[PDB]
Design a protein around this ligand. Sequence first.
Ligand SMILES: CC(=O)N[C@@H](Cc1ccc(P(=O)(O)O)c(P(=O)(O)O)c1)C(=O)N[C@H]1CCCCc2cc(OCC3CCCCC3)c(C(N)=O)cc21
Length: 104
Amino acid sequence: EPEPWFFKNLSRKDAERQLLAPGNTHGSFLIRESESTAGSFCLSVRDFDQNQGEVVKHYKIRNLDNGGFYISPRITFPGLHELVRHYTNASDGLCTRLSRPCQT
Ligand SMILES: CC(=O)N[C@@H](Cc1ccc(P(=O)(O)O)c(P(=O)(O)O)c1)C(=O)N[C@H]1CCCCc2cc(OCC3CCCCC3)c(C(N)=O)cc21
């Protein structure tokens, strides 16, 4: 299964609720298609926050001109796969590392 993280047709709300569901943890994520707008993707990741503990945050995956992707204009990956790779290896400015893909 090439992309267990690509929960493409999930709504913001369905993404959060899903991540904060059993079988998931810190760095547990998914890349759903953008809700508020369209055409771009979004990376939803569960994370630890001292106050209310487990939460979910969303990172906008802006589309590169040539078709690539990138959350930060510093590193601009060729595909959603290398994006998930680079951020799984290290947060690199993210609130947390992309440990493992969302489960259900
Ligand atoms: C309201 C919201 O969830 N905002 C998100 C970004 C986001 C997500 C989803 C959606 P959508 O509804 O379409 O699904 C939208 P929108 O409505 O506006 O279109 C926006 C966000 O602001 N998250 C923080 C989360 C962590 C706190 C700080 C932060 C930093 C960010 O970028 C900075 C650099 C840091 C170094 C690594 C690369 C990113 C981003 C970000 N989108 O890049 C988001 C957030």
